[PDB]
Amino acid sequence: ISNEISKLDPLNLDAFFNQLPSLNQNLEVSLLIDKLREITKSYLPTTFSINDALAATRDLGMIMSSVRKLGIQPVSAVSDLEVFLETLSEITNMVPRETSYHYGPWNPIGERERRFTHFPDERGLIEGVRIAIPGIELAIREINQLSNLSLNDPAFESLAKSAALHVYQAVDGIGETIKKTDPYVFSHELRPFFDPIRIGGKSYIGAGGGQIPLFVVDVKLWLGNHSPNSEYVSFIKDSVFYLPPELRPICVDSLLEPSVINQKFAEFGSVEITDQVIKGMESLLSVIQVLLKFRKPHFQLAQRTLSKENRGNYTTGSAGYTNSFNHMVLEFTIEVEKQIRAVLAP
Ligand code: HEM
Numbered sequence: 001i002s003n004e005i006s007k008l009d010p011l012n013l014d015a016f017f018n019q020l021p022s023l024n025q026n027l028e029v030s031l032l033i034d035k036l037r038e039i040t041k042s043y044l045p046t047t048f049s050i051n052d053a054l055a056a057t058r059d060l061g062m063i064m065s066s067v068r069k070l071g072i073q074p075v076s077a078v079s080d081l082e083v084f085l086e087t088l089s090e091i092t093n094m095v096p097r098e099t100s101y102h103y104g105p106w107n108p109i110g111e112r113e114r115r116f117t118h119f120p121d122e123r124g125l126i127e128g129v130r131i132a133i134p135g136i137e138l139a140i141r142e143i144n145q146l147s148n149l150s151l152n153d154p155a156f157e158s159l160a161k162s163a164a165l166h167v168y169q170a171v172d173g174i175g176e177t178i179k180k181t182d183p184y185v186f187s188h189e190l191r192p193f194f195d196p197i198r199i200g201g202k203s204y205i206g207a208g209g210g211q212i213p214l215f216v217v218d219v220k221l222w223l224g225n226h227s228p229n230s231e232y233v234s235f236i237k238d239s240v241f242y243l244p245p246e247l248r249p250i251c252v253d254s255l256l257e258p259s260v261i262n263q264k265f266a267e268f269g270s271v272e273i274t275d276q277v278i279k280g281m282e283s284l285l286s287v288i289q290v291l292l293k294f295r296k297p298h299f300q301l302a303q304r305t306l307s308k309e310n311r312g313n314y315t316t317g318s319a320g321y322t323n324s325f326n327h328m329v330l331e332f333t334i335e336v337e338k339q340i341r342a343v344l345a346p
């Protein structure tokens, strides 16, 4: 629950985070490192509650990401971080690194907001995931209920409508990014804060738009267990254990089970096609069209950011993929809209 994490400052870093964008702007790597050492000596993370460790992972993660921006592996330099992060990871049962959950919904609104830089373009990513994530999560719960409901039941269509409504939040989030974040300023000023960090022999990618649980929607709604060697399934496979634990069993189940649409494709061609059954199948295509209204503008944005003109020193997002990945997720989704449009043609 996000409001009880956002209000916490378990490492007393609030004043520091008002200095951070200037610290980062003047490349003051010594205050960064001095703060990491101070933390591993001023706090026994073992005594933390779950909410405390989640907010600590947010704050420590961003200081760590700021050191890695300059090119220094932060745990390699402050060796005592490794057991500190170990202990945080045990309490949270999440990666010893911040994700878009800590960057968005668990990031406080207003004066306490944790930001890497003074550029207003940064706000376009934070607001983007802070809006997207709550609505996808609600859609996730509602979409899971469609499996155990008949197309002919109005309850099916009302759940799918509520889910398409909640997914629109991700549209609102990506529209907020498109208006606030300059593709050039992002690549040159923001992107280098989301680079991999080596912690205990493993490398943990930085925060990413792709960490919003939208892929969980995908897996349950249309991907399921039908594209076993996809590159999309490998990304999801790599994402499962970055998600909060609450979401992992849904995602694992859905990867191992036929999708809602694939089953509802079957029930449709095997039952008395009533008027409610078509409304029900039309509410599935509504959800998918809401996904398209997100992926289409998202694609253009990453395309402008990664053009020769604006890409700066990168050719990939923080998860290591080019725009080819988004093109592939978008075509998957487009093709799903074509299959439903076909089932519905009469
Ligand atoms: C300048 C802004 C942005 C750029 C250049 C960008 C670019 C990318 C890239 C390159 C990927 C491939 C995965 C990776 O390597 O990280 C990706 C994936 C993804 N990103 Fe973005 N992104 C931006 C903003 C956002 C925001 C604000 C959100 C959420 C509100 C978001 C949501 C996603 C999602 C859901 C995926 C998974 C693929 C899909 O579902 O289409 N992105 N993005």
Ligand SMILES: O=C(O)CCc1c[nH]c2ccccc12
Pocket (backbone or CB within 6 Å): 100, 103, 125, 126, 128, 129, 191, 194, 207, 208, 209, 210, 317, 318, 319
């Ligand atoms: O999603 C990506 O991989 C690139 C966009 C991106 C990097 N860090 C981010 C943090 C929050 C929201 C979006 C991003």
